Amino acid sequence: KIYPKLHQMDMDKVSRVYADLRRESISTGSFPITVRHLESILRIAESFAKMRLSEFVSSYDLDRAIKVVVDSFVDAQKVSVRRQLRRSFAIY
Amino acid sequence: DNTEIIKSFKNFILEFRLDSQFIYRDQLRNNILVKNYSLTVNMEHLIGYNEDIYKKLSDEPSDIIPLFETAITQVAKRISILSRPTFQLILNSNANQIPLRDLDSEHVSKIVRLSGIIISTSVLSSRATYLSIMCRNCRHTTSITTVSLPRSCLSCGPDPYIIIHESSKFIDQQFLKLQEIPELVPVGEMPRNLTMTCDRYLTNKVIPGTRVTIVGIYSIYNVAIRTPYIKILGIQSFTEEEEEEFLQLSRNPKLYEILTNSIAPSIFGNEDIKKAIVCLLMGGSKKILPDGMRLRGDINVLLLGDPGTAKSQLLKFVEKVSPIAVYTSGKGSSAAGLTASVQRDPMTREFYLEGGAMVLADGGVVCIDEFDKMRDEDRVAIHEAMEQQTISIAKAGITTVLNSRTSVLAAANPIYGRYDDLKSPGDNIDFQTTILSRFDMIFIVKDDHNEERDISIANHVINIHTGNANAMQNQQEENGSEISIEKMKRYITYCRLKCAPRLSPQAAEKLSSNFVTIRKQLITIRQLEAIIRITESLAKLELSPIAQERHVDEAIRLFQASTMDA
Amino acid sequence: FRKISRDRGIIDKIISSMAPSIYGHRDIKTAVACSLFGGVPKNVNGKHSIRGDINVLLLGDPGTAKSQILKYVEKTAHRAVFATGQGASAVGLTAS
Amino acid sequence: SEIHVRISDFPTIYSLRELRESNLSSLVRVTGVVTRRTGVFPQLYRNYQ
Numbered sequence A: 001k002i003y004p005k006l007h008q009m010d011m012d013k014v015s016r017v018y019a020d021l022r023r024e025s026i027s028t029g030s031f032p033i034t035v036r037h038l039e040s041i042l043r044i045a046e047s048f049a050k051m052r053l054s055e056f057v058s059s060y061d062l063d064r065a066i067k068v069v070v071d072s073f074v075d076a077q078k079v080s081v082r083r084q085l086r087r088s089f090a091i092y
Numbered sequence B: 001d002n003t004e005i006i007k008s009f010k011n012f013i014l015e016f017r018l019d020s021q022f023i024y025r026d027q028l029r030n031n032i033l034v035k036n037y038s039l040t041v042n043m044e045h046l047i048g049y050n051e052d053i054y055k056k057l058s059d060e061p062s063d064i065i066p067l068f069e070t071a072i073t074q075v076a077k078r079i080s081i082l083s084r085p086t087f088q089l090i091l092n093s094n095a096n097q098i099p100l101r102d103l104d105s106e107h108v109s110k111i112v113r114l115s116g117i118i119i120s121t122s123v124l125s126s127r128a129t130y131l132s133i134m135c136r137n138c139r140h141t142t143s144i145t146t147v148s149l150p151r152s153c154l155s156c157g158p159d160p161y162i163i164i165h166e167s168s169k170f171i172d173q174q175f176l177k178l179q180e181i182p183e184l185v186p187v188g189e190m191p192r193n194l195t196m197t198c199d200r201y202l203t204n205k206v207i208p209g210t211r212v213t214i215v216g217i218y219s220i221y222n223v224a225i226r227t228p229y230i231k232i233l234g235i236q237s238f239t240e241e242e243e244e245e246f247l248q249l250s251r252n253p254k255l256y257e258i259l260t261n262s263i264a265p266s267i268f269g270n271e272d273i274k275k276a277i278v279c280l281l282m283g284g285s286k287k288i289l290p291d292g293m294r295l296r297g298d299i300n301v302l303l304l305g306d307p308g309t310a311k312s313q314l315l316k317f318v319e320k321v322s323p324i325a326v327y328t329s330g331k332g333s334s335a336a337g338l339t340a341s342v343q344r345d346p347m348t349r350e351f352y353l354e355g356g357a358m359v360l361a362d363g364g365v366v367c368i369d370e371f372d373k374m375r376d377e378d379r380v381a382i383h384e385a386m387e388q389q390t391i392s393i394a395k396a397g398i399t400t401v402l403n404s405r406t407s408v409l410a411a412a413n414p415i416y417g418r419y420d421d422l423k424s425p426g427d428n429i430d431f432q433t434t435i436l437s438r439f440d441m442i443f444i445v446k447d448d449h450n451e452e453r454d455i456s457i458a459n460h461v462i463n464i465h466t467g468n469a470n471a472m473q474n475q476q477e478e479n480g481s482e483i484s485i486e487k488m489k490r491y492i493t494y495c496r497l498k499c500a501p502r503l504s505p506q507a508a509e510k511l512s513s514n515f516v517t518i519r520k521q522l523i524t525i526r527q528l529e530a531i532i533r534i535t536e537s538l539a540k541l542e543l544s545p546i547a548q549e550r551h552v553d554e555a556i557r558l559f560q561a562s563t564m565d566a
Numbered sequence C: 001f002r003k004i005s006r007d008r009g010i011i012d013k014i015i016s017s018m019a020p021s022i023y024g025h026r027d028i029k030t031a032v033a034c035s036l037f038g039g040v041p042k043n044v045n046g047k048h049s050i051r052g053d054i055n056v057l058l059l060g061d062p063g064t065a066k067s068q069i070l071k072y073v074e075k076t077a078h079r080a081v082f083a084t085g086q087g088a089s090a091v092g093l094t095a096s
Numbered sequence D: 001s002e003i004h005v006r007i008s009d010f011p012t013i014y015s016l017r018e019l020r021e022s023n024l025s026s027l028v029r030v031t032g033v034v035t036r037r038t039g040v041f042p043q044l045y046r047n048y049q
C-alpha cells in the first residue's frame, strides 16, 4: 500500500551531508564515496518512511538513513583510517 | 482471359519511355548482351502506365506475377529475333515501407514493402523449374514446367514416372534473415526477425549486416503451427535545404563548442572527453597505398573509469547519437561472440552465416561495456579487427575473412579500486597490455572532490527521484544547450558521406616537430598515425577540403590529455 | 495497522523484533528490517529505471549466526528463494 | 462468431496439492507462479497457449 514520497524541503539535509562525506573521502581513506552511496541513502530513507506507513519522507527517517550508510562505510575501513573517521562523523 | 494480362505486360515493357529511353526494354537488351536473364521493373512506373495491371498485381500476385515472368520471356524471345530459359523479374518500389510490426492477416499473399538489416545468409540450394519424366511401365515421355509428379500414367500402376535428369532445368535459391532497423526498436523488446527467401540472380547480392529495402510477397506456409516468410521480389540498398543548412553550419565558428556541449548534457564536466567522442564519431580518413598497405581510418578510444563515474552513461548516450552503433556488455553481442559465426536455422534446415555485433557495424561505431571481463579468445579477433579491420572465421575445411571497419568505444575498470598515477597504464588496467597498445587515445575520467560539482550532481539525483528531471529537459532545450539528437545523427551521416579531408604540408611538418620534441624528452611510431587521424577528424567536422595547422593544437592537446593522463 | 503505525518508537519495535532469539548484531537487524520493506522503484519514460530493492552483504567470522539470519528471512518474507553458492549452477539460477 | 464466457470472483479456492479426484470435470480456482510459458499459435483458427 505505502509508497512514501520525498519532500524537497529535505534537499539541503541530503546534499550537504553528501558533500561533507565526499570531502572526508579524499582527506582520509582509500575508498572514494560514490553516487551509488547517495542512491543507497534515498532508498533506505524511503524504507524507513515505509515503516511508519507515512506517505512522505520526514527528517527523522533521513537521520537514521544517514546513520546506517555512514556507519557501514566507516566500519569497512582499515584500523588506522577507521579511528580517524569515527571522530570526524560523531555528529552523524 | 490471361492472354490479355500477358499482352498488357508485353506492351508495358515494349512501349514505356523514360529519359527518351525504353528503359525496361533497353535494360533487358543490355542484360541479354551481358548474357544474364534478369529484369528490374519499378512499381511507380507500373501505376503510371496502367492502374489496372498494378491493382491486379497488388491484390493477387500468386498467379499474376508468374504470368509477368512468362510474358517477359516471350518479350526477350521476340527481341532475340531482331538480333538475328525463363527470365526473372525484379520489382522495385518507392512507396512507404510499412513497419514489420504492422503486417497483419489482411496483407497475407498481398504485395508488401519492408525495410531492415540482413543479419544472416544461408548456403545456395537447387530448385526445379522445368522437368521431363518417363513412365517406368510403358516408357511414355512428357515434360512438366508444390509441383508433384502424376500418380497415374498419362499414356501402369501407382507412381509410374521417373525423372530424366539430362533433360531438365534447375535454378538457384538462397534463404536470408532480416530484422527491423535499430532506429525503431522499442525499449525492452526483441527486434522482429523475419525469414526471407530469394531465387535465381537475386542470390548472393548482400552480406550479413547490410541495410536494405524489401519488396516482396508476404505469405505463410506449413496445434496448427504456421510460419511466415517473404518471397523476395527486389531489394534496394539529403535535402537541398538540409545540405545548405549544414554548409552554412560549416561556416559557423562556434560549431566545435556547440557540438561538444550537446554530447550528454546531463553529465557534468569531462569536457575534453566529449571532444574525443566527437572525434570518434567524426572519425579519420582511410587511404590505400599502391604497395598493398591500407590505412585504418577508424579511431578507437578507451575510457578507464573508477566505479560510480557515470562510465555506463557515457557509452549509453553515444549509441543513440551515432547513426550506426551497437551496444555490447558482458560478452553479449548480436546473438554471437562479438564476431561472425555459422549456425543452422532449423526452419529451412540449412546452414547460415550469422553476423556478430562487430559485423553489423561495418563503417560505423561499436560500444563495448565491461571490456575487462570479456573472453580472451574474442580479444584476438578484436585485436585483428582493431588493426587490420578484418575478422577471420574458420569452419571445418574452409576459412573465411570478414570485413569489420568499425571504430571502438571501450570502457574498463582498473586492476585496483582506482587508477594510480605512480604506475604505467599497462600495470593498472585490468586486461591484456597488447590491446592497450592498440587504442588511439585512452582517457581516465576523474572523480576529484569538488563542492559545486558534487552538490550539483547530488541535487540531480533528487530531481530524478522527484520527477523534476522531465521538466529539466524542457529547461535545457529552452536554454539552447543541445542540438537535436535526430539532427545531430543526420549531421554525422552527412559529414561521413560528403567530406574526406587531407593533411596540409604545414600541418605535417608541425606534426614532425611535435613528434621529434616529444621523443627528445621521452610514445611510439604507431601513435603517430593515431594523432594524424585526429587531425583529419577536426577538418571533417568543419568540412574543410584539407586539414589545417590550426587543427594541430587541439589534436596534440587532446592526445596529450589522453596519453599523458596515464 | 494504522494504530501501530503511529505508536511511539515504531522503527525500534520493528528492528528489535527482527530475529528475536539472536543477540546483538543490531546493525544487521536494522539492515534486515530495511531490506524486508524495501524502497520505491522508479521508471522515467525515455530514460533508465531505478531499483528499489535493498542489497545486504553479511561478512563475518565463523559463528555470529549469519546463516541463521537468512533462515529467519526465508520464513518471514513473502516470497523467499534460498540458494547456496556451491549447490547452485549457472543453469539453475538463470534459466533452463 | 462466438462469445466465450469469463467467470469472475469464484469463491472456492484450491491449491495444487488439494486437487482431489472428486474435483475432476469441475470448475476450480487455484493460485501459483508462472514458471513455463509457451508462444502464441492458432488452433483448429483461434489463438492457443
Ligand SMILES: Nc1ncnc2c1ncn2[C@@H]1O[C@H](COP(=O)(O)OP(=O)(O)O)[C@@H](O)[C@H]1O
Binding pocket: A035, A036, B266, B267, B268, B269, B306, B307, B308, B309, B310, B311, B312, B313, B457, B460
Ligand atoms: N558528472 C555526472 N553527471 C551526472 N550524473 C553523474 C555524474 N557523475 C556520476 N553521476 C551519477 O552516478 C551514477 C553512476 O553510475 P554508473 O557509473 O552507471 O555505475 P557503474 O559504475 O556501476 O557503471 C549515475 O547514475 C549518474 O547519474
Ligand SMILES: Nc1ncnc2c1ncn2[C@@H]1O[C@H](COP(=O)(O)OP(=O)(O)O)[C@@H](O)[C@H]1O
Binding pocket: C021, C022, C023, C024, C025, C061, C062, C063, C064, C065, C066, C067, C068
Ligand atoms: N550472535 C549470536 N547470538 C546468539 N546465538 C548465536 C550467535 N551467533 C551464532 N549463534 C548460534 O550459532 C548458530 C549459528 O551458526 P552458523 O549459522 O553456522 O553461523 P555462520 O553460518 O554465520 O558461521 C545458531 O544456532 C545460534 O544459536
Ligand SMILES: [Zn+2]
Binding pocket: B135, B136, B137, B138, B139, B140, B153, B154, B155, B156, B160
Ligand atoms: Zn505408362
